[PDB]
Design a protein around this nucleic acid. Structure first.
Length: 138
DNA sequence: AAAAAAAAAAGGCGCGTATATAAAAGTTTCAATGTATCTATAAACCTTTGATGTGTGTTTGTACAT
């Protein structure tokens, strides 16, 4: 966690699974340890980071990533709490925007590359195949 | 061409993700303690090898038949 602290506190945010890949922490000993730790400094006293690191993991040009910052922020800004650990609803912006482009990143390839449920995608994409109205920049 | 068995396939059961509440029982993990088991190691013997007083040995002088 002090890494996840040290990471996020250094303005680089990584998912719990990502560190879990580095160290298997039973995903639970992580959580309780984090809460105290954060409050350790508070007494001693940001999911945006995920959009680009994902695009590169798929090897995409900047525009597809460029757009998602607008889309995810705009999808976040109005409504759609949408997600229970917004890690997922980040990726759907790529999926939203990758389909706005025509580049083969077929859902199955997305999943294992980013180790995400496929179900959260399409249902997450439900709120997108309907919200396709206001993301028109050009 | 027809009969029988397993898979293709999904949605949901039902509690892992938190999650704090508290008691109730028990486990495992950690560390001090105890012990036979490696090892060197210097202190045991045995043998070796260089230095060593000296038993035997070359000159002096001898009672002693010859």
């Amino acid at each position: 966690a002090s890494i996840l602290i040290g990471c996020r506190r250094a303005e680089v945010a990584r998912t719990f699974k990502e560190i879990q890949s580095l160290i298997h922490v039973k995903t639970k000993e992580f959580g309780k340890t984090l809460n105290i730790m954060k409050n350790i400094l508070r007494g001693k006293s940001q999911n945006l980071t995920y959009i680009p690191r994902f695009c590169s993991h798929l090897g995409l040009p900047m525009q597809v990533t460029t757009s998602a910052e607008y889309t995810a922020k705009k999808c976040k800004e109005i409504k759609e709490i949408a997600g229970k650990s917004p890690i997922t609803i980040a990726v759907v912006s790529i999926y939203l925007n990758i389909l706005l482009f025509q580049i083969p990143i077929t859902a199955a390839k997305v999943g294992q590359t980013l180790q995400v449920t496929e179900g959260t995608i399409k249902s997450g994409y439900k709120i997108l195949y309907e919200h396709r109205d206001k993301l028109v920049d050009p």
